[PDB]
Amino acid sequence: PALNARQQALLTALNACGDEMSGQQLHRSLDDEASMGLATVYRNLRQLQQRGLVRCRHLPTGEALYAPVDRDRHHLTCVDCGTTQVLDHCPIHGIDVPAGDFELLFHTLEFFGFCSSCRP
Amino acid sequence: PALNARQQALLTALNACGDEMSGQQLHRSLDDEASMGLATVYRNLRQLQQRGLVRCRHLPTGEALYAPVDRDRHHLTCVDCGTTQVLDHCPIHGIDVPAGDFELLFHTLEFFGFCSSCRP
Amino acid sequence: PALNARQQALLTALNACGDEMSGQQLHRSLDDEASMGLATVYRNLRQLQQRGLVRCRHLPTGEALYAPVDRDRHHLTCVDCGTTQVLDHCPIHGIDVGDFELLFHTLEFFGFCSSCRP
Amino acid sequence: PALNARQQALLTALNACGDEMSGQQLHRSLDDEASMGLATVYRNLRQLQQRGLVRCRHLPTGEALYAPVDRDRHHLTCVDCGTTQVLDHCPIHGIDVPAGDFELLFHTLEFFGFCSSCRP
Ligand SMILES: [Zn+2]
Ligand SMILES: [Zn+2]
Ligand SMILES: [Zn+2]
Ligand SMILES: [Zn+2]
Ligand SMILES: [Zn+2]
Ligand SMILES: [Zn+2]
Ligand SMILES: [Zn+2]
Ligand SMILES: [Zn+2]
Ligand SMILES: [Zn+2]
């Protein structure tokens, strides 16, 4: 098929941001011309996800962050204080999973531990 | 300090399930001898997480699932229909983190694509 | 006979744990002073099994789980995802079964969980 | 799904043998027409196991033995010398588990003790 105007506006906003965006950040980024209700943002994000055009991950707090499917950024996160840093590059280096008759689009990879302040 | 009786009962239940459980599923799994209130389950889970004895991740739905920290099971999930399969083996088994005094506990690795039924 | 220090340390650890333990979990759980190589853990477990003091079962993927012989817990296991529930009671309690001396039984159920059933 | 030619060849060989077979025994049983690599045998057995079309049980040594899912044979085994005898019939007589939202396929039932030679 082809993208409706709301799906196109969300993909444009996700591409324009250098980072991931929460549903609320994405909602606040829309100007009058592109404006839609918050529930409409989430519905249209879900459709973009089902078409494999948007990726999602959750912070430890449960907040969802969205990005274009091609943005493959991974983090180290302290399980105590939640402090987080981005990895320089993806350590899988584009290698394929071993290969079950499943068409692969992307991976989320997140590392968890204790920062200097929190380590026992 | 050593693990109290409630912390031990939760670790036992998470080990016995062979996979992961939400806080509500963990609560429903406890036998008469291990049973405690739901708020007690959440408080004790949070403590186990902070001690690095339990790992947590979020499903695409935003539900939080818990497992023993050493249970390292990854999935393929269809972004269209939400069908999921567990991988028999971790494809990044033994990975080190690249580069200042951060103690690694675990990684979350999840693959997303289209299943046989959904692939265009 | 009587148990050597290594056999006693493994039986103590299996009794102290509220559930079954893999050989690797048992190995990691030992006190520093009683610690031994993983192959030594397996050799000593095999001796405890031969004396009828420890029971063993295998997960579908081949991992061995050990417990005191007296712990008679049975499971429902999904053959797809490996999700498991313990049965609250033994469903063959009181079952009947020359010169074979019976010590214990393993009883394990396999199927599809709600998520995996097509 | 449906069975590929390798899955069909393994099911045929397991049905043709009067009892259970290790992956290596199954591999050695295949004729020129049905032959495949050992790793292919294990991969295809694992798939059949996950689909509930073959049953698996482990000898005390850890060796995996496979059979058609409907073949329900149980044993008496000496824990000392490993000598084993088959039970003349299943004493559960097809009775169902008590009955959560779980579809039951089969049971493994194994008895353990000391043979005449072994009790000290
Ligand atoms: Zn921290
Ligand atoms: Zn990556
Ligand atoms: Zn690199
Ligand atoms: Zn699908
Ligand atoms: Zn892993
Ligand atoms: Zn399952
Ligand atoms: Zn029993
Ligand atoms: Zn014997
Ligand atoms: Zn039977």
Residue numbers in the entry:
A (entry chain BBB), B (entry chain AAA), D (entry chain DDD): 6 to 104, 108 to 128
C (entry chain CCC): 6 to 102, 108 to 128
Quoted passage from the original study:
SynZur (SYNW2401) is a metallosensor of the Fur family that responds to zinc, and hence a confirmed Zur protein. Using Synechococcus sp. WH8102 as a model we show that its zinc-sensor protein Zur differs from all other known bacterial Zur proteins in overall structure and the location of its sensory zinc site. Thus, Zur in WH8102 regulates both zinc uptake (via znuABC) and storage (via bmtA). Although homologs for the zinc excess sensor SmtB are absent from true marine strains, homologs of the ‘zinc uptake regulator’ Zur were found in every genome inspected, including a range of Synechococcus and Prochlorococcus strains, Trichodesmium erythraeum and Crocosphaera watsonii. These putative bacterial Zur proteins are members of a larger family of metal and peroxide sensors that also comprise Fur (ferric iron uptake regulator), Mur (sensing Mn2+), Nur (sensing Ni2+), Irr (sensing heme) and PerR (sensing peroxide).
The structure was solved to a resolution of 2.1 Å employing single-wavelength anomalous diffraction with fluorescence detected at the zinc K absorption edge (9,666 eV). This approach was necessary because molecular replacement using a range of bacterial Fur-family proteins failed—indicating that SynZur adopts a structure that substantially differs from previously determined structures. The asymmetric unit of the crystal with the space group P65 contains four protein molecules. Interface analysis by PISA36 is consistent with SynZur forming a homodimer, with two dimers present in the asymmetric unit. Each monomer has two zinc ions bound with bond lengths that are within the expected ranges; one is bound tetrahedrally by four Cys residues (83, 86, 123 and 126) and corresponds to the structural site mentioned previously (site 1). Although some Fur-family proteins harbor additional metal-binding sites in an analogous location, SynZur is the first Fur-family protein in which this site is the sole sensory site. Thus, SynZur not only harbors a new zinc-sensing site, but also displays a unique orientation of DD and DBD.
